[PDB]
Amino acid sequence: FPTEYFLNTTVRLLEYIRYRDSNYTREERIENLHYAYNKAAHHFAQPRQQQLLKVDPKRLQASLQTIVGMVVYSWAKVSKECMADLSIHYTYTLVLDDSKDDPYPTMVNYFDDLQAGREQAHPWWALVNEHFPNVLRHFGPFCSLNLIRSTLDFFEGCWIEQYNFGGFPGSHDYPQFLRRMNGLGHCVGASLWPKEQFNERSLFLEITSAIAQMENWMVWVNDLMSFYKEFDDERDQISLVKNYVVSDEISLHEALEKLTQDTLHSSKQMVAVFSDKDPQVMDTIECFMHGYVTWHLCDRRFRLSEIYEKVKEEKTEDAQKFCKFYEQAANVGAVSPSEWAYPPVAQLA
Amino acid sequence: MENFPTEYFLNTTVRLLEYIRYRDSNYTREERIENLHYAYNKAAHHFAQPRQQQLLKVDPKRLQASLQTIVGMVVYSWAKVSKECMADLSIHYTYTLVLDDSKDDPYPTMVNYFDDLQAGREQAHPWWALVNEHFPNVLRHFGPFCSLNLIRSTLDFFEGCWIEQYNFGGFPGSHDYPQFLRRMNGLGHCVGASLWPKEQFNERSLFLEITSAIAQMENWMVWVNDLMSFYKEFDDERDQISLVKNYVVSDEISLHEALEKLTQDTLHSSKQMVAVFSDKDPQVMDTIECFMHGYVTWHLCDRRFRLSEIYEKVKEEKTEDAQKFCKFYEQAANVGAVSPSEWAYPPVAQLANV
């Protein structure tokens, strides 16, 4: 694992986005983490949700905790209710990402049932659409449209992913098409602007620009941070990086390099465009980038904890700034689940 | 008025037509006329019904002209699908083109979009009421996967038109904006996925090919449309936004440097289309190839793009690129230059009046 560059890329990333301390205290996090987890936990524990959502309890439990953490840490400026409803929604998506059930049969009459107002045949659709208003009530019409499309796109993305296809060699457009497809980019980018805080019309241009730019920043940062939990214990898996290799016929290094260039360029442009815009907008954007990063560093799912010791006692200009940031993370990001994730969904169910 | 890069334009177009192998086909003029009239006739009767005439606010002449340009585009590019499929897709793409004529804020009509959708109540925006009501006639020709693609792309397109009412070319420095917008309103996945009727293709057996075609066709189709349109938009002080114009504003580069980017992308895209599908399933490569040829012919033949003006200005020039252009142009004209009196009749308005 080329930690040398993995650590260089990472440093520049936090430097570009202006990584630093927030007035978001550890106590405030625990307060939010628990509120979001608690509402979401009661939701998934209901009989109907338990029945239609075929998920291994331990998996549902772990997915819910990872998501609540992602939301509470990145959507730092929205209400607790908004954090909770968004946690339920993104937990549905992470659960669909892991499903192995063929969609085809249940999508045969999708449109006619949609148009007729009949419950969808695919159970995931039946639950998500029934719950969707709980999320949409926090946004104006434009932002709501963006969340709906993004989730529909994401559904197709998971469909395509079940084929574990990295694309034909020479199909240069496939990698990013698939990533964008299941990256929930416009869902994340639009869910950052609750109508109780932002006026969708007054800031139409700002929000639309955020969605456009945040879509790529978010997916790319997630790919870079996930390069470890993936390059290590893979599984014939496909990924943006593993697809660049197969489709653009390049080396794993050339690929990971291409990603690094985009993530940095994307970070650079985020700052340039929004630094002089509405302070509230910039603030939400900055809080998301930093929180999203804190989330990757802290959450076990990405095992960035292992990438610690191997460099905690070194003397580099990168591997040394790595811990500085890493520790700032833990200083407020390292929180024991026992402090918020309880009781277990299974117990409530 | 500056100066249209005629030389450069001529060169790119010629390089374009070669990379895709622009050449004659067994699709005859008489066959085109049968399809043109068939597609137009069903669509014309469709838009002439009272409900459609009432909910679809469009100037009659504009609608007449839009339908004719769309029927031509579909008949020439979706050459391998049935007459019915050609007719139903003609209606769909005419709805999309017509929405571009509206200046009305969608906001008020989208406030309750999701709840009305989930509950099965007719949508408040008149465009959605007509489009969704007609959609099954288009979807019946495709399996579940391709259908999902058409539904998403049309939803993306609706948002794309919403965004365009702001005539926003992007914030200086917002590099991701241009392609975000062009992709939002390009209907790429609608086109790409509509090329595979279930009567001629098995969705599940060709999943990987279709998905790949969708991914690659999306970019080829919009970039080619941008390049072939570059001429008509060049002096259009009325049209303020486009992929190239937005590159200028968002990337902070010259129109020429922006046109260079579109060119590299279009040419590069064409080469990869051929390199990927040349050794794939026969029917797939045929549909793909015919779409690229039909699509290019359409641009060369439809008055909309005024390419006939570039032809005229250089039909006597002894330059190499020019020789090739006029030749290709003449090819297109030989099979695609058909008088509307031969297929587009009677007028939509006449049928609506009856």
Swiss-Prot record, chain A:
GO terms assigned for molecular function: metal ion binding; trichodiene synthase activity
Other remarks on this protein: Trichothecenes are sesquiterpenoid toxins that act by inhibiting protein biosynthesis.
Residues where Mg(2+) 2 binds: 222, 226, 230
Catalysed reaction, written as an equation: (2E,6E)-farnesyl diphosphate = trichodiene + diphosphate
InterPro entries: Isoprenoid_synthase_dom_sf (IPR008949), TRI5_ascomyc (IPR010458), Trichodiene_synth (IPR024652)
Annotated keywords: Lyase, Magnesium, Metal-binding
Recorded consequence of changing residue 226 to T: Increases the KM for farnesyl diphosphate by about 77-fold and reduces the kcat by about 9-fold. Leads to complete loss of activity
Group of enzyme by EC: lyase
Biophysicochemical property: pH dependence: Optimum pH is 6.75-7.75.
Domain of life (superkingdom): Eukaryota
Pathway: Sesquiterpene biosynthesis; trichothecene biosynthesis
EC number: 4.2.3.6
Result for mutant: residue 222 to D: Increases the KM for farnesyl diphosphate by about 6-fold and reduces the kcat by about 28-fold. Leads to complete loss of activity
Organism lineage string: Eukaryota, Fungi, Dikarya, Ascomycota, Pezizomycotina
Listed name of the protein: Trichodiene synthase
Pfam families membership: TRI5 (PF06330)
UniProt: Mg(2+) 3 binding residues: 236, 238
Result of changing residue 97 to E: Does not significantly perturb the overall structure of trichodiene synthase but leads to an increased KM, a reduction in kcat, as well as to the production of anomalous sesquiterpene products in addition to trichodiene when incubated with farnesyl diphosphate
Annotated organism of origin: Fusarium sporotrichioides
